[PDB]
Amino acid sequence: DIWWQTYGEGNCHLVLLHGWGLNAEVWHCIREELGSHFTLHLVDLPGYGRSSGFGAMTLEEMTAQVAKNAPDQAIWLGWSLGGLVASQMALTHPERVQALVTVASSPCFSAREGWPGIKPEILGGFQQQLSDDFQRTVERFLALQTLGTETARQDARTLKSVVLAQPMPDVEVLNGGLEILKTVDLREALKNVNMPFLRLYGYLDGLVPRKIVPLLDTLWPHSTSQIMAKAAHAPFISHPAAFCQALMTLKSSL
């Protein structure tokens, strides 16, 4: 079964989805601040963290499992890979999604024609590297997410601690997750979501290039965006106050 946790007692439900190679413990730093304003629903994505017994899955397969024991109605907030899951949830069960929020996430992580992103050969390299250098490879992908910030060292340690505090997922699971990043492109599909859609980014993010923000402001006219100036790929860790404020403003606007 998929591991779900409820935290807090706020009058708006908020689902929080973590990124690749991690688990819901990444949200520990913002729980207290958010818990009076939201009831939080924290999930370990299938195959990750405490959600054992799953193998490689496509985004479609993964989201359908996450949906099973998710709350009836909530804001859905996804970080990085979690942002793809939240997006797919908005596309499949719009009546269950009060608002879609992505944080440091792209609808298409891989660079393509006219589209900034990660070279797909780089993601393929990480996949290949998992076979013989499993632990360091996971850590090397995570190490990219905190660079250039005021709190880079501390924040990289935070993510590494999250990884090390639980058993490692199966290589199959991790390889499959990179395949989702490498192959999924939700740019066209997301034009059609009609609930509030807020996209948060870190200016210094080395995985999700800030150049995509104006491209998507134009491609997705119903959506809105905010760039945190001094944050990289984990803005809720480096800048929890600004992150929480964005969610307050969203909550009031529903």
Residues forming the site for Cl ion (CB under 5 A) = 19-20, 80-81
Nearer to Cl ion (CB atom), residue 33 or residue 101: 101
Question: CB of 20: closest distance to Cl ion in angstroms?
Answer: 3
Question: CB of 142: closest distance to Cl ion in angstroms?
Answer: 9
Q: List CB contacts of 107: < 8 A, sequence separation 6 or more.
A: 84, 87, 184, 185, 186, 187, 190, 216
Look up 80 and say whether it is catalytic.
Answer: yes
123, 178 in Cβ contact below 8 A? Answer: yes
Count Cβ atoms below 10 Å from residue 14 Cβ, excluding itself: 26
Q: What single letter denotes the amino acid at residue 163?
A: V
110, 179 in Cβ contact below 8 A? Answer: no
Q: Is 141 labelled a binding residue?
A: yes
Please state, in angstroms and rounded to a whole number, the distance separating the CA atoms of residues 32 and 215: 35
Q: Is 3 labelled a binding residue?
A: no
Q: Is 159 labelled a binding residue?
A: no
Nearer to Cl ion (CB atom), residue 79 or residue 220: 79
Nearer to Cl ion (CB atom), residue 40 or residue 142: 142
Nearer to Cl ion (CB atom), residue 19 or residue 202: 19
Look up 205 and say whether it is catalytic.
Answer: yes
Q: Is 20 labelled a binding residue?
A: yes
Q: Is 166 labelled a binding residue?
A: no
What would the two tokens of residue 72 be?
A: 């009836």
Nearer to Cl ion (CB atom), residue 80 or residue 98: 80
Q: Which helix (H) or strand (E) holds 39?
A: strand 39-43
Q: Check 80, 87, 105, 106 and give the catalytic one.
A: 80
112 φ, ψ (degrees, to nearest 5): -145, 180
Question: CB of 19: closest distance to Cl ion in angstroms?
Answer: 3
Q: Is 243 labelled a binding residue?
A: no
Q: Check 105, 205, 238, 239 and give the catalytic one.
A: 205
Instruction: Report angle CA 126, 102, 239 to the nearest 5 degrees.
Output: 90
Question: CB of 26: closest distance to Cl ion in angstroms?
Answer: 11
Question: CB of 178: closest distance to Cl ion in angstroms?
Answer: 9
Q: List CB contacts of 106: < 8 A, sequence separation 6 or more.
A: 83, 117, 208, 212
Q: Check 13, 41, 233, 239 and give the catalytic one.
A: 233
Look up 222 and say whether it is catalytic.
Answer: no
Binding-site residues for substrate, please? 20, 80-81, 141-145, 233
Catalytically active residues are 80, 205, 233
